[PDB]
Design a binder for this molecule. Structure first.
Ligand SMILES: *Cc1c(COP(=O)(O)O)cnc(C)c1O
Ligand SMILES: *Cc1c(COP(=O)(O)O)cnc(C)c1O
Lengths: 512, 512
């Protein structure tokens, strides 16, 4: 009952899962904790800041570059002054996307401090586009109302009264202006996929499906409709139910009718090339083509969230380029801080980019000189030696995927699938809510199965894995590109061991 | 004509204000740019990352500590593992607030990556509290409906029909359940002060008054009511107009009546101890007492935004402690990164803290090992030598305030006031929209006066000032506590020069 100032419930829960350890040092693919005698125990990290560490913990090149930047007196805080490095970083990302998509498209960069902040820059810029469309629409409706009023008062035309159910000249116009104003003030909608993860701030949390994380906060901010990635013939009808009308007067020279016109409700569509909250499921070509159709049909941007899939994780710089997702806006974060600093970027296509965004959006820490310098170092490293780092991610990915398939094949009773691509992989666990072992069943019923199994891997095999998915029903594997053959072999041994214990329903060995 | 990838409009506008310079190096209170011949030109920084640099640029202690943390292989990415430093930081801030307020209150800490993110943790936790109040209220109303239904059906009591304007037993109950459900789904409200600045993300932007920054994004997220800080007898009535009711059945033994009960609409009240977007105006005792009354009356938390006013800027660690603002939640950011990294914290009083927040809120970069280590260094520095650093801020603040008053006294034709406290000060500029000089008048009409004057200070006196307030009608002075007497004298000379040119309406010298 001693005073506690942070993390009491978090630490309590981690301890009961078998994950209550303090990591005191990290290098490459290894984190170290202290045993009861104070000796360092090496642990293989498969979590790696949820994919932040493409080059591992504390990479010597990144550490050396950061120390040189600090010793040179880099200007970290230079707000409202010329910062050329931002333009230099945007140019590199622009060149990389042209190379990988073969499209000669140009993107403006706005920097931020987290993946959530970068996704919220996109939500905001998407809402600027929607307000432009609304102004244009309402300007036309005024002109259509003036013309109709002209025709009805002068006498040239008669008002059809079969149309009045949708709401007498001046009264009908005021009634249309009221209807349209109510509509204009309504919150927009965002479209996402089922299992989507786009961050946990007031705006972005509405775009994250995981129900315990989101549903408490529903009232704060614009909702998302979660489109079923699996059943995509249902997406058409879900979006069609979200159609909303404004009213105007249509003159067909001699007759005037009240009619509905489309109102732009949807601000943006968001998509992850590889779906973190769905267990690392890659977007299929069929789902990509449906997202393209919705973007072309609604005229709102398609925002590609590469916060996790970017900076080479999938075996290309851009996961979207590898899977043929043709986005309007793109976001990057995790790996761009080199595993030491915090940085993110929204890339917005220049033919849609509203220059007001460059001066009405800002942040104290955004575009700081230190994360800028380190971003340029990370881009230099991932681009080095004629694209060999992408080739190495692809080869390491194949090796790790092959091992995971070989484990699934012999353990199909407890593993349902292997998902993801490059070095962003996961095993799907079969439901254990009917397990013979009461301890396993109880944990699976509370959605803690994945964490319990992660605990086993830590204490028995010195391997750090974290679960994914809304019931911790997936085990994530997202190590650095320096993961060795020996470390993949040790992971295979650890998994065969874990899935043999789970098969044998050994609750005493798995659950504390 | 050439390809540009970021900042074309930002740089264009900075160049035309006379602020188009690249800072290449920074130490203490000085940033350096290169002249045409490639020599470093020293510039005195009064902006200092908008108050981030209480210890100046690249403080050797902070640089040395950051390099040691990188050389020791600090675990930056240790998500879902024991990170004791979070608890250790919260303990220090907890002790500091007890010392400065004399209250023996305890606070839980949630870390984030920016001031906006910390303010959004508070908005989210405030919405958890409101949902708890709503559940309790709706649980009572069910019990009140059951009891009334019992009394009306059994026969013991009669339903009064003078009360039905607010909507047979079953019908009246269904009509109350409909009314109450509509109300329950309505968006909450936040209360802020006029001129409030609380960040620029989807949620926090609604809490920031500056109209060009906010009004484009109105539709996205729950609105704020901006309370007039100046006219506080009007606040009572503005908040009273926001009262909303749910309905229930009140049994007074023989008689059952439909009655209104209070619905919790307001999620939180936010306040800055020193109001950045109002031109560094301190909260008066009268305004503090009104915020206290609203918090006690509505039962929502009072959130104190110390993102700018904290870590000693005002001459205490907490600005709220100095001005007697008794908050439920507190936020810190700018100076806690030591001018090199990005970190923020929400302190939520433990008797209000809902433990679900510890496991349903998270962020990839939050609570990273590197910013944690540097937070502990910054707290060690500001607390050192029995509170001498607070004494030094107070005496440097007095010296700088006295100089600014001495300039106002001789230049009252162009300067209306000195605002703020400690080392967070500003000059208010008199309106120049009627200036004889057409160049000055034109800039003042566009709200760019402060930027133009800042340009003068840079090119003619090598002094970096940035404006504040919604029409750049204030000049900010927020240097490090190492600002020398000689640097204050050079600033006085520069300001006398600027305000003499402004008096003389010398548009050719002031505007390019
Ligand atoms: C981690 C993550 C985010 C949010 O990034 P933060 O830095 O945690 O705000 C957004 N999208 C995806 C796909 C992520 O994995
Ligand atoms: C700067 C500031 C913020 C926003 O902090 P960021 O780090 O820019 O998101 C919020 N509140 C106040 C009072 C500030 O000065």
């Amino acid at each position: 009952g001693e005073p506690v100032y942070a993390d009491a419930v978090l630490n309590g829960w981690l301890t009961s899962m078998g994950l209550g350890v303090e990591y005191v040092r990290a290098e490459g693919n290894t984190v170290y904790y202290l045993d009861d005698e104070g000796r360092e125990v090496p642990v293989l990290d498969h979590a790696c800041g949820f994919g932040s560490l493409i080059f591992g913990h504390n990479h010597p090149e990144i550490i050396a570059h950061a120390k040189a930047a600090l010793d040179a007196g880099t200007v970290v805080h230079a707000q409202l002054s010329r910062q050329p490095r931002a333009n230099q970083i945007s140019r590199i990302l622009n060149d990389i996307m042209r190379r990988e998509t073969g499209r000669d498209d140009r993107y403006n960069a706005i920097f931020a401090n987290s993946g959530a902040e970068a996704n919220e820059i996109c939500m905001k810029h998407a809402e600027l586009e929607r307000q432009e469309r609304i102004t244009a629409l309402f300007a036309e409706i005024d002109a259509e109302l003036d013309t109709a009023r002209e025709a009805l008062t002068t006498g040239t035309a008669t008002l059809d009264t079969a149309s009045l159910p949708l709401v007498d000249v001046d009264g009908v116009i005021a009634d249309i202006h009221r209807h349209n104003d109510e509509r204009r003030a309504e919150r927009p909608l965002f479209l996402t996929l089922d299992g989507s993860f786009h961050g946990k701030l007031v705006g972005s949390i509405q775009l994250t499906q995981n129900e315990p994380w989101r549903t408490p906060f529903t009232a704060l901010s614009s909702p998302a409709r979660f489109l079923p990635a699996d059943e995509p013939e249902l997406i058409g009808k879900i979006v069609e139910d979200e159609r909303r009308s404004v009213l105007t007067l249509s003159l067909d020279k001699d007759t005037v009718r009240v009619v509905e016109r489309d109102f732009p409700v949807v601000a943006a569509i968001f998509v992850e090339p590889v779906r973190g909250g769905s267990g690392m499921k890659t977007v299929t070509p069929e789902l990509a083509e449906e997202l393209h159709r919705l973007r072309d049909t609604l005229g709102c941007p398609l925002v590609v969230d590469e916060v996790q899939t970017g900076i080479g994780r999938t075996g290309a710089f851009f996961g979207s380029a590898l899977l043929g997702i043709r986005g309007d806006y793109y976001t990057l974060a995790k790996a761009i801080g080199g595993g030491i600093v915090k940085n993110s970027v929204a890339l917005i296509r220049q033919d849609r980019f509203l220059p007001a965004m460059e001066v009405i959006h800002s942040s104290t820490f955004a575009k700081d000189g230190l994360s800028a310098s380190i971003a340029l170092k990370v881009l230099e490293m991932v681009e080095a030696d004629g694209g060999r780092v992408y080739q190495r991610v692809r080869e390491r990915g194949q090796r790790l995927e092959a091992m995971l398939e070989s484990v699934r094949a012999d353990h199909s009773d407890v593993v349902s699938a292997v998902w993801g691509t490059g070095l962003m992989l996961a095993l799907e666990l079969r439901d254990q809510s009917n397990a013979t072992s009461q301890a396993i069943r109880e944990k699976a019923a509370h959605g803690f199965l994945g964490y319990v199994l992660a605990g086993f891997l830590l204490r028995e095999h010195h391997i750090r894995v974290l679960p994914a998915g809304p019931r911790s029903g997936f085990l994530r594997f997202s190590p650095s590109l320096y993961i060795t053959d020996e470390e993949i072999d040790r992971t295979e041994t650890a998994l065969r061991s874990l899935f043999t214990a789970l098969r044998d329903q050994d609750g005493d060995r798995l659950v504390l």
